[PDB]
């Protein structure tokens, strides 16, 4: 069979597929036209019917997996289009595959003859395949980063960062909802609570605002809006600072607060509706990503996900709000291949199977 | 003069007047008419103008105060409104005042000739005013309860609490915004931290979503919804619970989740929309709360503000949210003269000038 990952999320499904490299002359033989069908089909194209995509600038190159060498590639859909997934399966196996949509539609992978699908532990699959990733690699670069200088925009730039001793990590994935996991050893990780506030809030609540009709499309908006149109600030409060508890005027005291004036409703423009819906949501998972890191003792926080995908307004204030509101104790940390690590977990069970 | 205490907040201006009823023969000649004006306008009406109003409940009768007895009464009006009231001041004195506008409209207070303005701290007036009232009670009764078995509609019924050893405390002040505070002592107190997802949050969202124009109306409107139309839930996700994690069906993964999806954005009502407003923000307060009272090891959460007044069904799902989440460690408890403490504790600042 070929070798598979999948995490049916509640809006993405990832999947993480192994393409040998090292097929023998006898193994080509050996090797049934479907196989090859699938195989070139899937490696020949990077749009996959219309709403499959392979990212290509993910590739693991000439990685070595279950004694074979390989590339490891990432390709996603919307869990919407399940079926034709499923339905293209049936015209053409062990799977192992997590996400709630691994418990949601076990019947209907089910209707694939002999299909035989191993539903593995969602926790157990985002820590080892985000171990595993950053173990090997993103082709002798550094799967971690984080923004240096968070604070100053003329500073502010992505760099590197070590992830050998991993331990203790705080990790936030930010998908539909939220989950904060906290990671003590290979062995010792927990859910620590989650918040409902997520990229599906996001994306969601922009379009109410806007009529937006893509993921893409609400962040275009929000590049160009202004936040401050919609959200009332400390300084609309105080008229300045309010030094006696810290709080610069700049910061967002009530969001959508000045969306309760009739004449501010009327004035506010999409784009400023955009941003201040990412704004909202962003600051809201940070806050709560340092409130457990206080109480975990864990001072570095990887955020996962694919919120964060081609999302760099987000992660950019992830980075300064995390370090200015920590006083610098808590940094901010991102990965290259932040959406997949369940994915990848959920391939990496097959020897057990 | 008479005896006001003002908080003047981001959307509100709540006043405590002190009206005296041991008046002597020889005290009421040597009162002036416009005092007098004063003190039977204020008495015999409850709706003052177009906006403001007089919680007559609320008011606590044959106080002693400041070696006096007198009435002390809770007026509210929009900050919005703060010129006409200025201006009444300016058409016929020591102000003790506290929030936010105490600041920004300083200059403002000062048009009127020899006012003297006395900013007080936010911080010190919630507490000494909570503090105050309830150590006076409510004409008898408990100022402070709870809703007991808050888990099972057919029994959960408000009830008294006792907070005669009140220390240590977690109050949550929902406003505009929300403030989080940790009372350790009558002298140990501080601003724990905040969120921008306050009352100002829900008033200006369900605004932009639904055309409400005015708290009640949003209130009315989110009484008649099913937030699960806009929100996803864990069952959505994974076709029922989540016991590995401990997260029933019904709970909420995505706030707006199901809004990503165009032909549900075209089936949601108003009212659906306004119940997931109301929902979304109070879990949220909730959730930071409790994550807040176990850094803190506070086990008793006291709730504050006006985005509870006449808001019974965020006040039930605060005490079903802290009771089941935190496994019964934690009480959600609140207060009948929430929005007034500032007010209150600004009034009790008038001996020290
Ligand atoms: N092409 C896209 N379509 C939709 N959402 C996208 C897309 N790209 C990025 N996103 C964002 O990524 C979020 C979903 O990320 P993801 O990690 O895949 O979660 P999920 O697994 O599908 N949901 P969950 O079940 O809660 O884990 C969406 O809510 C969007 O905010
Ligand atoms: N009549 C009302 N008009 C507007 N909002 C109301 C009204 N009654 C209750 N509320 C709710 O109460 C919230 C404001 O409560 P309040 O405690 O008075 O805050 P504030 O002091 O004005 N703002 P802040 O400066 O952040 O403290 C509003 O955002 C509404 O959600
Ligand atoms: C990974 C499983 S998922 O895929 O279904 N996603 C997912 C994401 C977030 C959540 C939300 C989540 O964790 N809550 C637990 C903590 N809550 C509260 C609420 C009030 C209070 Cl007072 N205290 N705590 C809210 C809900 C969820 F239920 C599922
Ligand atoms: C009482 C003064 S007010 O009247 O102006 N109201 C008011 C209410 C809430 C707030 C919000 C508040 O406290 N924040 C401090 C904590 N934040 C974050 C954000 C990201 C991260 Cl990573 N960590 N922390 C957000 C802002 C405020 F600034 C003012
Ligand atoms: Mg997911
Ligand atoms: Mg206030």
């Not at 694919?306 to 081609?310: A, E, T």
């Given at each position: 069979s070929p070798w598979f990952g999948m995490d049916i999320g509640g809006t993405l499904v990832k999947l993480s597929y192994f393409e040998p490299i090292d097929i023998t002359a006898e193994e080509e033989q050996e090797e049934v036209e479907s196989l090859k069908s699938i195989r070139k089909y899937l490696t020949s194209n990077?749009?996959?019917?219309?709403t499959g995509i392979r990212d290509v600038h993910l590739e693991l190159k000439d990685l070595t997996l279950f004694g074979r060498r390989g590339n490891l590639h990432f390709i996603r859909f919307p869990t919407q289009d399940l079926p034709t997934f499923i339905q293209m399966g049936r015209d053409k196996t062990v799977l192992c595959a997590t996400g709630g949509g691994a418990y949601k539609f076990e019947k209907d992978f089910r209707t694939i003859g002999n299909l035989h699908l191993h539903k593995l532990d969602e926790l157990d699959c985002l820590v080892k395949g985000l171990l595993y990733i950053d173990s090997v690699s993103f082709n002798g670069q550094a799967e971690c980063y984080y923004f240096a200088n968070a604070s100053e925009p003329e500073r502010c730039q992505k760099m590197p960062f070590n992830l050998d001793d991993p331990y203790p990590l705080l990790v936030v994935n930010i998908g539909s909802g939220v989950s904060i996991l906290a990671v003590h050893s290979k062995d010792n990780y927990k859910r620590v609570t989650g918040t409902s506030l997520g990229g599906g809030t996001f994306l969601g609540l922009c379009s109410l605002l806007t009529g937006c009709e893509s993921f893409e499309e609400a962040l275009e908006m929000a590049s160009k809006g202004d936040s401050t149109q919609a959200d009332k600030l400390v300084r609309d409060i105080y008229?300045?600072?309010?030094?006696?508890?810290?709080?610069?005027?700049?910061?967002?005291?009530?969001?959508?607060?000045?969306?309760?004036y009739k004449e501010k409703r009327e004035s506010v423009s999409k784009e400023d509706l955009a941003r201040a819906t990412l704004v909202t949501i962003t600051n809201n998972i940070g806050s709560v990503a340092r409130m457990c890191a206080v109480n975990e003792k864990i001072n570095r926080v990887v955020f996962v996900g694919?919120?964060?995908?081609?999302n760099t307004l987000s992660m950019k204030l992830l980075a300064y709000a995390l370090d200015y509101w920590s006083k610098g104790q808590l940094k901010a940390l991102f990965l290259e291949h932040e959406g997949y690590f369940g994915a990848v977990g959920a391939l990496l069970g097959l020897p057990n199977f």
């Open positions: 990077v749009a996959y019917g219309s008229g300045g600072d309010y030094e006696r508890f810290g709080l610069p005027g700049w910061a967002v005291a009530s969001s959508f607060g000045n969306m309760i694919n919120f964060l995908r081609v």
